[PDB]
């Protein structure tokens, strides 16, 4: 169980364009095409990314490729981040995956917002950061995924991902 297998469970895999909980055009393993409302504008982004004329359809392969580049960018995102880096450095390996999971999902900006729970993570206050994490819109939008992530920061194990 590692960051890739966790993210796969949470985002799933979709070969055709889709919209996320916020109304954004996404594809593959949670890959965000763009924030612009146009389906054409998104389909352009997809082609410029996959490099070929897809018609908003891709293969398992091209989705796996976006996934690798997305995990990688999430990681360098935490490391270039002055709010995020020190919390990351301060965490263990499992917990570290939890934070990449979040940045993958809502971006460095979205996650740096979480000041109070980030502060609590950097202080090892497992229990209090979880409550804080649950007190949020993220939780309400994506509650089962949020639960898994939260528990991961809680317990430090992959339990949420191994049990029903």
Swiss-Prot record:
Upregulating conditions: Expressed late in the viral replication.
This protein's UniProt keywords: Antimicrobial, Bacteriolytic enzyme, Cytolysis, Glycosidase, Host cell lysis by virus, Host cytoplasm, Hydrolase, Viral release from host cell
Superkingdom classification of source: Viruses
Catalytic activity: Hydrolysis of (1->4)-beta-linkages between N-acetylmuramic acid and N-acetyl-D-glucosamine residues in a peptidoglycan and between N-acetyl-D-glucosamine residues in chitodextrins
Protein name: Endolysin
Effect upon mutating residue 117 to F: 10-fold decrease in enzymatic activity
GO cellular component, one term: host cell cytoplasm
Binding site for substrate: 32, 104, 117, 132
Family: Belongs to the glycosyl hydrolase 24 family.
UniProt-reported outcome of changing residue 26 to H: Facilitates transglycosylation more effectively than hydrolysis; covalently bound substrate
Compartmental location: Host cytoplasm
Gene it is expressed from: E
Catalytic residues (UniProt): 11 (proton donor/acceptor), 20 (proton donor/acceptor)
Protein purpose: Endolysin with lysozyme activity that degrades host peptidoglycans and participates with the holin and spanin proteins in the sequential events which lead to the programmed host cell lysis releasing the mature viral particles. Once the holin has permeabilized the host cell membrane, the endolysin can reach the periplasm and break down the peptidoglycan layer.
Consequence of substituting residue 30 to A: Almost complete loss of enzymatic activity
GO BP terms in the entry: cell wall macromolecule catabolic process; defense response to bacterium; peptidoglycan catabolic process; viral release from host cell by cytolysis
Effect of residue 11 to N: Loss of 84% of enzymatic activity
EC primary class: hydrolase
Annotated phenotype, changing residue 20 to E/Q: Loss of 99% of enzymatic activity
Principal location listed in the UniProt entry: host cell
pH dependence comment: Optimum pH is 7.3.
EC numbers: 3.2.1.17
Molecular function per GO: lysozyme activity
